[PDB]
Design a binder for this molecule. Structure first.
Ligand SMILES: Cc1cc(NC(=O)c2cccc(C(F)(F)F)c2)ccc1Oc1ncccc1-c1ccncn1
Length: 246
C-alpha cells in the first residue's frame, strides 16, 4: 500500500497532540472519513522517540477491536510522518469527565468492560500498554470507548513502573474506574513528590458515595504487588461490573 498526502482531503483541525496536529480527513479514493496526524521527524528525533513510533505503529497496525482506535496505516515524506487513524466523533473521555464532573456506575462499569475487553484481546497477542490515561481514550458514535494508546504522567503509573508485564494494565483499570466515579485520579497530590509517595504506598481513600462493589473491585486492582491483582476475566466477571454494565 503506497499512501500519500495527495490521497486525502484535509478538513478542520482536531486539536493538538504530543508531537503534531490531528486533522479530520477524507480519502479521495474512498470518500471515507478518518483522522490524520502529522508528526515531524525533527521533533521526534530530537527527543528520542523515533524508535517508539515505529515500534508502536507496527504493533498498533495489527490490533483489531471495536474498542481500540484503529490505525489503517502510516507513511512519511522527507520531514513529516503521517498516521491514518479511525475518526472518533465524540471526543476524549477526559473531556467528557470534566464536563460531567464524574461518571455514574453504569457508565463506569460499561467503560471498564470495554477497556477490559480490548486489554483481554491485546493479551492474547502479548500486547500490553504501560500507561492508559483518559486523554488518550476516545469516544465513537455510539459512545463506545476506543483506546488510542499505541502502547507497547505519574498519575496513571503503577508502582513497579516508577520505583513488569501485563499486570500493569490491571492497575490501569483500577485508576480509571476510580477517576470515573470520583472525578479524579486516586493518588493525585499537590506535589509531584507526594503523588510518587502515595502511589508507592498505594494510599487512597474513597468519598462516601462510592459503593462497596466499586471499592472491592478498585481495592483489588490497586495492589502494590502485581501478581495479586486479578485477571481481566475476573474483572469482566466482577459482581459490580456485571450488575452495572450496559
Ligand atoms: C489520541 C491520539 C494519540 C496519537 N498518538 C500518537 O501519534 C503517538 C502514539 C505513540 C507514541 C507517539 C510518540 F512517540 F511519537 F510520542 C505518538 C495520535 C493521534 C491521536 O488522536 C488524537 N490526538 C489529538 C487530538 C485528537 C485525536 C483524534 C483522532 C481520531 N478521531 C478523533 N480525535
Amino acid at each position: 500500500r503506497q499512501w500519500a498526502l495527495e490521497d486525502f482531503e484535509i478538513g478542520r483541525p482536531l486539536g493538538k497532540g504530543k508531537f503534531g496536529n490531528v486533522y479530520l480527513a477524507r480519502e479521495k479514493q474512498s470518500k471515507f472519513i478518518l483522522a490524520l496526524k502529522v508528526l515531524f521527524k525533527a521533533q521526534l528525533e530530537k527527543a528520542g522517540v523515533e524508535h517508539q513510533l515505529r515500534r508502536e505503529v507496527e504493533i498498533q497496525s495489527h490490533l483489531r477491536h471495536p474498542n481500540i482506535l484503529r490505525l489503517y496505516g502510516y507513511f512519511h515524506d522527507a520531514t513529516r510522518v503521517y498516521l491514518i487513524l479511525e475518526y472518533a466523533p465524540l471526543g476524549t473521555v477526559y473531556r467528557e469527565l470534566q464536563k460531567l464532573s464524574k461518571f455514574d456506575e453504569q457508565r463506569t462499569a460499561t467503560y471498564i468492560t470495554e477497556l477490559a475487553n480490548a486489554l483481554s484481546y491485546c493479551h492474547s497477542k502479548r500486547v500490553i500498554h504501560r500507561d492508559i490515561k483518559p486523554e488518550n481514550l476516545l469516544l465513537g458514535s455510539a459512545g463506545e470507548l476506543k483506546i488510542a494508546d499505541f502502547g507497547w504522567t505519574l498519575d496513571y503509573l503503577p508502582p513497579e513502573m516508577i520505583e513488569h508485564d501485563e499486570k500493569v494494565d490491571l492497575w490501569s483499570l483500577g485508576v480509571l474506574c476510580y477517576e470515573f466515579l470520583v472525578g479524579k485520579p486516586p493518588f493525585e497530590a499537590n506535589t509531584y513528590q507526594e503523588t510518587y509517595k502515595r502511589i508507592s504506598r498505594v494510599e487512597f481513600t474513597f468519598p462516601d458515595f462510592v459503593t462497596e462493589g466499586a471499592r472491592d473491585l478498585i481495592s483489588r486492582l490497586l495492589k502494590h504487588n502485581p501478581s495479586q491483582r486479578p485477571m481481566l476475566r475476573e474483572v469482566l466477571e466482577h459482581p459490580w461490573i456485571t450488575a452495572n454494565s450496559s
